[PDB]
């Protein structure tokens, strides 16, 4: 039970362990400082500014596969409530990766097969 | 992650801040005192009655783009739990605006990108 | 009986024997931002409505509300009118104009014998 | 430039002589005194009430091809301006007939084929 | 179990009481004397002549919603056998109304709910 | 309220008077004596046999719009019960005509429009 | 082998070695209301059939029977014929014409050796 | 030969024995005294009003699979003529049940297979 | 002139003579004693049970064109009223054949073509 | 704000006031003692058995609009948590009506429009 | 491996035991002595004429769900070779039933599940 | 202007020399003496009987791609008039071959290209 | 269970007796000597050469319904194994006919109906 | 409220009592020790590998209705929160069965119908 | 080279080596003793009963992907004749695996590529 | 009457003589020793493995019409039983050719056309 | 990167830094029946493959095998090449050509600072 929603290209992946959740996000062309990242309960929010390709007035864009929007964001409802305060994150090479330990109440417990 | 539902034409907008939600509602031709408004948890209700164009018996309606219903309403499920008791509201020029501070358990905490 | 112009603005048009009422929805517009003129059989309504103002902390996460700031309507009525005696009031987002008909446009009875 | 418009079943025909226009209108079930008829210039208006089939509480309508609306009307733009003040009209057998003499400015004059 | 059939515009309605049947018929533009009306058992027949709009040779029909046919008729099979001989009828304002008391064998009798 | 049914091409017409029914039937190429015809109540039957074009063995049919069947028949349910015993009939030029006086219980009585 | 004209009139066309028979349905027509001529390879049939006559007491409540009073057919045959020796009989609504073939149109044997 | 017809949701079932017809009818929400039930020959009529769900002005209908109409009725033509005067009926728990003994003339008599 | 209706596969044919109707019914795999057969007026009823193919628990049905229903029936409305009391019937080889003499009132009488 | 789900025909309506929810259920032909009714939190369960129309072996069902299932049920999720212990319910005339007072935590509080 | 093929309506069913095949066949209207039945290897043939419904020249077929063909036949390839010489057969009530013991080489031998 | 017409499967080919026309025709299964062949002007006629495959009452036709018609014929309009009296024809191996010398009036003469 | 396959127009028929199989083949325009014919078990092979219409260089083919292929053949799998060595064949008039007595193992044996 | 989701063929069934949920799951080809099973709140997870059909290099798979994937899993959101720590489970014959007692807060309490 | 056929869900795979065929069958929820397994020539038969999920009358099936049939079977025709007597079989974990050594006459012998 | 089946691109041709079958197979890029080939009865098998285009890590495939699979195979059911032990085979230039003499029981014997 | 010509002949095209390999399926063709030339950026392959030879006793009863005897391909490559140092081998129905790139077509590095 997960829902993404927001504006602008931003490919997400979601990885679930027994005791945590990893979220991965593509943000090519974004500055680490331009990225806000907050969470609580079962929701994670990612906000990003990417400034546009700056062209001198000599230059023209004669071809482009690259999205224009400068404001981009995603709100992600995850399969488990998490501990925001132990959440880590790094940002290398256009890729954001967030680690979100699960709250105890959301950690599943085994059932033996007899 | 939002749900609107009820009877009547009533264009809604929803604005999220870090610590509040604003809801805006179009209600042309309604009287401030004919509006009821309550909330709790993560749900807002707006009720309204707008009386119909009153024609003398000499006059006929020869053309109307204007909805007829006299009972109108909306129930709105917001993306955060709120503090009803600090909610304020205004009604100017056919437009209702409601401010609803977020409850502390719904306020999101930062994660640092190291 | 032709409407035409830019922007969301629900009109209704009422006819009496001696006048035309025109009603218009203009939620979110300020009385002083509305221009209103007329002559012969045509009525013009122009309005500006400024956009919902957001602090830089806030985002719009959902909107059914039109964005255009310039809105107008030209309305050709089923009778010539007297502009000079035309009245108008603006309550609660609703504009109502009253437009007495010109004498030349007032219909006279025929008897069914 | 013959434009009919209004509400209600009401079949009109329109007959043009050199010096007049005849409008014929079906209004079965209407009382002569419940009919308003006015004109000016090149427009004719016909307004009528027809009260509904009267049923005692014993009776039921088990079949009907007969329109139910009580308010019925028509505005008709003619192909010539007329002299309202000389217009006549009878109402026999559910049929209204209106005679509308043409204004002089609207009476066509001949061209000789030499 | 009712069947209309015949030629020409003639909107019928049918009303049923415990002890009778009313039939209503629109016949704008028809002369009372031009209408034959007979019945037996469970069938009613209505025959009508309406003569055409008569135009002088100056005049032209430049527009018409009004049916042309001069012979019009309807045969109506009703939900009950009736007493023709006690049948009444009046014709006002383009509308024929026929009253047709039910035969005794066709009058339903109540059933008590215990 | 009519039903035809049976085998073969046989164009039927039906004429109603106040006191009779006439039925007309096309039967090209049939012999008056090869026709059976009976009635009772409100049903007429027509039976007929038409022998086929007889070709010598030198001759071939190189084109035919003409039905082939030799047995042909029709059962016709009329809108009134009849007196069989006063029924007459004629057969001229491929056309059969039958006159069938109505029984007294099927003859319709007038209603006066007051 | 072309048919053409106005009105319901089922034709059949039979060929012998030495003649053409033409058959035609004309129910409700009077022998004397039928004109019949021919030449070379063409046959014409014209007929009038008067309408079903109704007293003013009677109504037609159902009809599968064509209404046209003028009916005709022009038929181009697969051989030239001798008009002058053409015969014809009219029984029971059915017209039958016999049309001997012209000599120039009679086919001669070829032997299969 | 089995025709239903009239206004309103009202699921009928029909049951034939050798010597009677049973009609069953769903009429949830209806009052025993609000039901009229009469019959003659081979027809049964059922009439019933059901008053609408009543709401205080605090309350709103937020959802509803339940038809709204208040006047509801059924005319039923049965496969047999019956004896009205011996017809009984019960109304328990939303369900009307009607027992209609067949008339003698309508009771089928056996044929032996030899 | 005919209506069949009921449950089950059971091909009927219907034969009309001057003085009787013959009904024929396919009923393969039914037992002569399992057949009930009654009639009155213009309606015949055939009822039949056929028991299912009997399999031992060793055996499986590996292919089957043969209907499964065990209750089968037809109610037939004929083109004439009949004399039930003089009706005979035979059951050979899966085929039921019923002979139903017409009642006098339903026998057609000749009309002479002069 | 609502989800219904389960097996069987069983029209529900749902009414919301300020302080309670009313659920209404069509259940014609069910017995008050055959109805089980429980609730907790924001979910109501209705279970019901209705036994089938009872036919003697003389009798056949010749026509039926009436569902056959005998096990019927609904699980309903309401727009508010409720107080199960103060819930009442009535079963008249095939109609079940349940009253479910809202829990305090689910009651909405007013906001003033200044 | 199960192929039917031939002329005429003839509903087959096929039944397998461990040690035989049963073929069942519908042949209503057929005479025991008009049926030929032979077999070898894994094929069975069934041939049968049924003479047509016989009508006096007074009588007409007015209706008929019953196939007309007189020659009817079935070739059936079975899932097993059989012993023709021990095959039996009965013909009661329209139904042919054939019992075909399997040949030894075709009888399956068990495998134990260890 | 090459027109073929008649009944029956009979493939024709047509070959044109300077001074003749060859017609070839398939007629497998036909006896040379059952073929009639005549011509005049620009038309050739071919008539043939082929009697059907002869089956003893032991045998059955279990498959067939071979046309059944016994009467077969063709009329052929050629692109030139011919001299019937000098026409020859053989019939070998189911194939008829006809040689038809061209009439002098139909023999083309050369044009020199200068 | 029969399969044809091969190249070129060659209409086949297949006739089956109790003790043999007849195959018939159309081969207009083929020389008896140009036809090879072999068989074994349950398959028959037919090979044929037909040489093309030979045209002098004066002549043109201006129209043709006649297949061109010179090599034609069919392999036919029959419903029974046969005795090749007792197989006869004749070839008259473009038609090949082959007689193929059945092998004893393929001759079916009767089953008595008791 | 009942959501399945994940990789692989694995037919689930879900069973509710008053005081528990039973989950059943098909897992043919899987080893008891290759199955992981955990739960908390209202979610159950099932994970399982099944190794693939093993073929020697002589052998080939010539046909296969059997899915190939080796990793298979199911996340299931149930209609009730449960008590993980008392959940049991058996795995016989391809079938996993899990018993999940409901938590007290989720057990529905009865309402009396007065 | 293969035909499966029978009743029920039961995924088969088929493995061919040089000297045997392996058949694999999904049969989750079946009991080893409820499985019958025979073979001969080139055909294998698997028969199985599986009893239905057992519910107490407290419990309801609220969701189910799991087939219901209790009788399930497959008849399989293999690409080789086999030695039934040396066939083995195992049933673990819902999976049946049968090993079927090829008969000598069905074992392929090498051909050398020179 | 032929069946091919297996994995991979491998264009097959089949040539029949009176006394043999030749099979030709395209196998570009396969090594003579990587080909297995066996036969018996009326079935031929061809197995082959072709290793993939081997690219150094500087090189990329920028375009390929060439199938990728490394395992390829074909099983071929021929129209005659063969003598495996006299089968020969060749493999030149990517093309395999196999000669397979027919067994004596599959060699067809002549029929004389008398 | 354009292919064009007559006949079934699956090509693949491999690029290195310094050369282009071209592979081509030509089952049933004789090494000596293959012509192979090139220049600048274009490669041509022509081949004849003679048809499956049948004795007059034998018939082809089924064939998935193309019949055309003339087959060819013209291939325009993504670089100009050195024809003179082009090699080529033909094993097992498969033709493989190696075509070193011309100097003017060899790409040079750019550094990412």
Residue numbers in the entry:
A (entry chain D), B (entry chain C), D (entry chain B), E (entry chain D), F (entry chain C), H (entry chain H), ...: 34 to 147
C (entry chain A), G (entry chain A), Q (entry chain A): 35 to 147
Please share excerpts from the published article on this structure.
The small heat-shock protein (sHSP) class of protein chaperone is an energy-independent class of chaperone that act as holdases when combating the potential of misfolded or damaged proteins to form aggregates. sHSPs are also assembly chaperones, associating with protein polymers, such as actin, microtubules and intermediate filaments to modulate both their oligomerization and their assemblies in cells. HSP16.5 from Methanocaldococcus jannaschii (MjHSP16.5) was the first sHSP to be structurally characterized by crystallography. The crystal structure confirmed earlier protein structure predictions regarding a central α-crystallin domain (ACD) forming a β-strand sandwich comprised eight β-strands (numbered 2–9) organized in an immunoglobulin-like fold that is flanked by the N- and C-terminal domains that dock onto hydrophobic sites on the β4/β8 edge of this β-strand sandwich at the fourfold symmetry axis of the oligomer.
In this study, we analyse the effect of deleting the IXI motif and substitute the highly conserved arginine (R107) equivalent to the disease-causing mutation in CRYAB (R120G) into MjHSP16.5. The R107G MjHSP16.5 crystallizes in the same rhombohedral space group with eight independent molecules per asymmetric unit as the WT protein. Owing to the high diffraction data quality, the mutation is unambiguously confirmed even in the initial electron density map calculated with the molecular replacement solution using the WT structure. Clearly, the mutation does not cause any significant change in oligomeric state and overall structure. Closer comparison between the higher resolution WT structure presented here and the R107G MjHSP16.5 shows that there are no significant changes in the main chain positions. The root-mean-square deviation of 6299 equivalent main chain atoms is only 0.45 Å—clearly within the accuracy of the crystal structure determination. However, it is noteworthy that the R107 in WT MjHSP16.5 forms hydrogen bonds to the main chain carbonyl oxygen atoms of G41 and M43, and forms electrostatic interactions with the residue E98 of the partner chain.
